[PDB]
Amino acid sequence: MKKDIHPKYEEITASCSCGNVMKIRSTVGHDLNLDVCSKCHPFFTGKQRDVATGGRVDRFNKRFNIPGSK
Amino acid sequence: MQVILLDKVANLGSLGDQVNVKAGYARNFLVPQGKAVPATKKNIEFFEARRAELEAKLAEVLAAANARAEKINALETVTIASKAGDEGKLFGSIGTRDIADAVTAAGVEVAKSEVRLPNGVLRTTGEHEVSFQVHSEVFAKVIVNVVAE
RNA sequence: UAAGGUGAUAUGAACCGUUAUAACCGGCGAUUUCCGAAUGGGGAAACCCAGUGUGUUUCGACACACUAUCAUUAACUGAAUCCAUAGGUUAAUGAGGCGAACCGGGGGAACUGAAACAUCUAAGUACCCCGAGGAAAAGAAAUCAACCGAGAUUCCCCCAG
RNA sequence: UUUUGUAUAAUGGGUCAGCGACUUAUAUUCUGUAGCAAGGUUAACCGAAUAGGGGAGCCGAAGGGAAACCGAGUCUUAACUGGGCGUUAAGUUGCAGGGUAUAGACCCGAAACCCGGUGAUCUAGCCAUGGGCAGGUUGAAGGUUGGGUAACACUAACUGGAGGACCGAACCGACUAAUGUUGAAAAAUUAGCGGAUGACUUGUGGCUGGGGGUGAAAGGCCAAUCAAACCGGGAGAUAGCU
RNA sequence: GUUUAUUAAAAACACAGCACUGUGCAAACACGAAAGUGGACGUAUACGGUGUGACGCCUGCCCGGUGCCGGAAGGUUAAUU
RNA sequence: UGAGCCUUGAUGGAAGUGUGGACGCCAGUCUGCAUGGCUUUAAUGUUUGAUGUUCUAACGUUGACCCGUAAUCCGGGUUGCGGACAGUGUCUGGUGGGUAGUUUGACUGGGGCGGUCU
RNA sequence: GCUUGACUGCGAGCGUGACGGCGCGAGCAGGUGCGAAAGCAGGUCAUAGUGAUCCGGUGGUUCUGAAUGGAAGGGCCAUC
Ligand SMILES: [Mg+2]
Ligand SMILES: [Mg+2]
Ligand SMILES: [Mg+2]
Ligand SMILES: [Mg+2]
Ligand SMILES: [Mg+2]
Ligand SMILES: [Mg+2]
Ligand SMILES: [Mg+2]
Ligand SMILES: [Mg+2]
Ligand SMILES: [Mg+2]
Ligand SMILES: [Mg+2]
Ligand SMILES: [Mg+2]
Ligand SMILES: [Mg+2]
Ligand SMILES: [Mg+2]
Ligand SMILES: [Mg+2]
Ligand SMILES: [Mg+2]
Ligand SMILES: [Mg+2]
Ligand SMILES: [Mg+2]
Ligand SMILES: [Mg+2]
Ligand SMILES: [Mg+2]
Ligand SMILES: [Mg+2]
Ligand SMILES: [Mg+2]
Ligand SMILES: [Mg+2]
Ligand SMILES: [Mg+2]
Structure with missing residues (x-):
């Protein structure tokens, strides 16, 4: 639902x-x-995966300079 | 797989490894409170300009914290009875306080976070050994004893 | 604009007007109870109850006026814990609800057809949810072409059933 | 009307009046007719709008082969023969009609499926808070006392007052018969009947929602509706049947 | 005692009792996309599910089939590399 | 405890007397030590796959305590217990009338049973 | 006894089917076998011994192959 840093998903599909x-x-x-x-x-x-790994190449700071700003 | 300890800790690296290091291990422990690392361009180059002012520690800082085992050894016998009783047992709780607090029985003070004793101390009265563990770099020695009252 | 005129089912009564503020029409205003996003709190909708300020006051009162919740910023206050935050108060902005269709988007059938039925169809239709505009959306090539070249998106006829 | 066949006692219609069912769009093909002719015709659009302009393009004058390819020929085969398909058939564009295709496709009609809402003011459970049960009967446990036991048990009376206890109104329910059956009544009336201090009965309000609820269980009940409620929608569902 | 409101009141449902089985508590199990709630402000003398249906005397043989319970050495075997 | 590189090993200072491990077609040689004048394969370094140990530091906590707060929610903090487990997401083998969508022919002296469908 | 005509490419004209299709067939071309030779042989005395299409598999071929040369894939022929 979250994975805040990155968007998320919860989109449907047919299995x-x-x-x-x-x-x-x-x-x-x-x-x-x-x-x-x-x-x-x-x-x-x-966050979640793809969100957690993102906080790495990036920051922790810029990875948050958005969930605040915007 | 890329960090910069600098403050080596049993890790296969000192002064910060510039080559393949462990990963996921630092995400939550090493980096936080421990030795920050990010071997990413920015932080990397910044390590070069170092580290005299930061290295002077092993020479100076170590000294301002190594005199521990020397400042406190000849210490007068620690006479902090731990309420020895119970037909041959005790009442006083021997754990962290009396161990360290056994120093300000005259004035000097320490930090309870430096004790070195895996097992809790059997509530005895004998020569309670107290291996003061101020810092990894330097260990000290203290004692504790219980009396009857 | 003007001799009439006081909306309609019915006059009638009592009247207003004929010159130029009587009607009547158009613009800008004034007023505009109670309910309703309803917003001071509650509530079986149009009812019930309060706090804090006010004027006239024969100076109890009448009503009035403000007081919802969120978000942004501002200042002031401010925990466990020095700090700092969390939290709190105030204030100025702003939102909130309706809305026919077209539009973007999130979720998404089945009857039906296949002369049965699972792939497949119906159809991304029905519907439900969110959002915005006067249109929305898309849009200045990591497009296509074929060794010639064209040159953002969009809509129309062809290519072709 | 439907049938091999109906006066048929097979179907439909009490009568009259008004309404009531092969349409429409585009595509394709024939027929008639008109234009032009190896050529016919424009589409969108422009527009001094039914003009005129626009020939992008569609069809035909060439066909054969799976195709490359060849071409009044061409495929076939190694074949130069034969055999298949072609070769001195005029088409094309409107207009009106016959048919077909995609559509609701002559009209009326299912039982149903799916989507979203409305319903526990009936009823089924349950929650909270209140109320009701004339009268008469039986008479358990416990106890007091006498007896009696070393002490109890045991017993006798008296007191005591239990119980999904007894009889029976209210109240609750429905076993039987008659009547009613276009009823007084879309389940009742009359005479009997069962329970009636209990798993009782009832007022008020609340909570469970549809493939879901509730169910001392019958597929019962969920507003005169239940092997899947009602309302609106997909919807002119589909109907080789009448 | 309960039941087919509106053709069935019964031998049917229930019942107390019995048995099997599950559950160590954030219980099993159930409602629920989740949060959460019921079970229960209970905790194995408790709670659930199944069958039998006071009480009396009892409840025999079969584990081949299916299901369940234990084992899991060996055979077969998914994604994955 | 497996395996990859491959690191160190055994095949493919000048005589005599001796001690040990080596194996046999067996009658033997191999091989350290005094006096005397590349692969077949083993150990350590390792890289990596396995089980199993313990730790805290992600993660859990429907334990306790402190604030927000004269809250049973929630959040923060301290502390305890659990701990790379549990649990979640993607993928994957089971099981799966719990639910769903369907199929389950015709001929026939009615149909069904039987029989037959070339 | 000798052999491989259970041949390859075509086929006048017929029979029989709603159709798909099925059957008969002299004769022609290339190469065969048997016979001295005329000639016979395109499976069995004839009539049953069978499965359309699609999706594919195998071999062959410059038929095609999305910028071009290839290739994959498609066609065509043979066959499962
Ligand atoms: Mg109000
Ligand atoms: Mg209000
Ligand atoms: Mg069908
Ligand atoms: Mg008849
Ligand atoms: Mg008749
Ligand atoms: Mg008529
Ligand atoms: Mg011919
Ligand atoms: Mg009774
Ligand atoms: Mg009768
Ligand atoms: Mg009666
Ligand atoms: Mg009675
Ligand atoms: Mg009620
Ligand atoms: Mg009903
Ligand atoms: Mg439809
Ligand atoms: Mg209809
Ligand atoms: Mg009874
Ligand atoms: Mg009945
Ligand atoms: Mg009855
Ligand atoms: Mg029984
Ligand atoms: Mg079923
Ligand atoms: Mg269906
Ligand atoms: Mg039949
Ligand atoms: Mg024969």
Whole structure:
């Protein structure tokens, strides 16, 4: 639902089988929290994968300079 | 797989590894409170300009914290009875306080966060050994004893 | 603009007007109870109850006026913990609800057809949800072409059933 | 009307009046007719709008082969023969009509499926808070006392007052028969009947929502509707049937 | 005692009792996309599910089939590399 | 405890007397030590896959305590217990009338049973 | 006894089918076998011994191959 840093997902899709299922699929990603900011100290964001790995090449700061600004 | 410890800690690197390091290990421990690392351009080059003012520690800082085992060893016997009783046991709680607080029985003070004793101390009265563990770099020695009252 | 005129089902009564502020029409205003986003709190809608200020006051009162919630900023206050934050107060802005269709987007059938039925169809239609405009959307090539070249998107006829 | 066949006692219609069912769009092909002719014709659009302009393009004058390719020929085969398909068939564009295609496609009609809302003012459960039960009967446990036991048990009376206890109004329910059956009544009336301090009965308000609820269980009940409620929508569902 | 409101009141449902089975508590199980709630402000003398249906005397043989419970050495075997 | 590189090993200072490990077609040689004048394969470094140990530091906590707060929610903090487990997301094998969509022919002296469909 | 005509490419003209299709067939071309030779042989005395299409598999071929040369893939022929 979140993965805040990055968008998210929760888009639907149909999970076909052998030929076809007109069913539906959805909810993905995950969560976690408690991220230590070099500054004061951690607010627990509920990012997920692709969100967690993002806080790496990036920052922790710029990775937050948005969930604030905008 | 790329960090810069600088403050080596049993890790296969000192002064900060510039080559393949461990990963995910630092995301939550090493980096936080421990030894920040980001071996990413920015932080990297900044390590070059270093580290005399930062290295003077092993020479100076170590000294301003190594005299520990020397400043406190000849210490007069620690006479802090831990309420020895119970037909041969005790009442006083021997854990962290009496160990360290056994120094300001005259004035000097320390920090309870430096004790070195894996097992909790059996509530005895004998020569309670207290291996003062101020810093990894320097260890000290203290004692504790219980009396009857 | 003007001799009439006081809306209609019915006059009638009592009247206003004929010159140029009587009507009547058009513009800008003034007023505009209670309910309703309803916003001071509550509430079986048009009812019930309060706080804090006010004027006239025969100076109890009448009514009036403000007081919802969020967001941005401002200043002031401010925990566990020095700090700092969390939180709190105030204030100025702003939102909130309606709305026919077209439009972008999130979610998304089945009857039906296949002369049965699962792939497939119906159809991304129905519907439900969010959002914005007067149109929206798209849009100045990591486009296409074929060794010639064209030159953003959009809409129309062809290419072709 | 439907049938092999109907006066048929097979179907439909009490009667009259008004309304009531092969349409429409584009595409394709024939026929008639008109224009022009190896040529016919424009589309969008422009517009001094039904003009005129616009020939992008569509069709035909060439066909054969799976195609490259060849071409009144061409495929076939190694074949130069034969055999298949072609070769001195005028087409094309309107207009009106016959048919077909895509559409609701002559008209009326399902039982149903799917989507979104409205319904627990009936009823089923449950929650909270209140109310009701004339009278008469039986008479448990416990106890007091006498007896009696070393002490109890045991017993006798008296007191005591239990119980999905007894009889029976209210109240609740429905086993039987008659009547009613275009009723007084879309389930009742009359005479009997079962429970009636209990898993009782009832007022008020609240909570469970449809593939869902509730169910001392019958597929029962969920507003005279239930093997999947009602309302609106997809919707002119589909109907090789009448 | 309950039941087919409106053709069935019964031998049917329920019942107390019995048995099997599950559940160590954030219980099993159920409602719920989740948060959360019921179970229960209970905790194995408790709660659930299944069957039998006071009480009396009882409840025999079969584990081949299916299901369930335990084992899991060996055979077969998914994504993945 | 496996395996990759490959690091160190055994095949492919001048005589005599001796000690040990090596294996056999066996009658033997190999091989350290005093006096005397590349692969077949093993260990350590490792890289990496396995089980199993323990730790805290992600993660859980429907334990306690402190604030926000004269809250049972929630959040922060301290502390405890659990701990790379649990649990979640993607993928994947089971099981799956719990639910859903359907199929389940015709001929026939009615139909069904039987029989037959070339 | 000798052999491979259970041949390859075509086919006048017929029979039989709603159609798909099925059957008969002299004769022609290239190469065969048997016979001295005329000649016979295009499977079995004849009539049952069978499965359309699609999706593919295998071999062959410059038929095609999306800028071009290839290639994949498609066609064509043979066959499962
Ligand atoms: Mg109000
Ligand atoms: Mg209000
Ligand atoms: Mg069908
Ligand atoms: Mg008849
Ligand atoms: Mg008749
Ligand atoms: Mg008529
Ligand atoms: Mg011919
Ligand atoms: Mg009774
Ligand atoms: Mg009768
Ligand atoms: Mg009666
Ligand atoms: Mg009675
Ligand atoms: Mg009620
Ligand atoms: Mg009903
Ligand atoms: Mg439809
Ligand atoms: Mg209809
Ligand atoms: Mg009874
Ligand atoms: Mg009945
Ligand atoms: Mg009855
Ligand atoms: Mg029974
Ligand atoms: Mg079923
Ligand atoms: Mg269907
Ligand atoms: Mg039949
Ligand atoms: Mg024969």
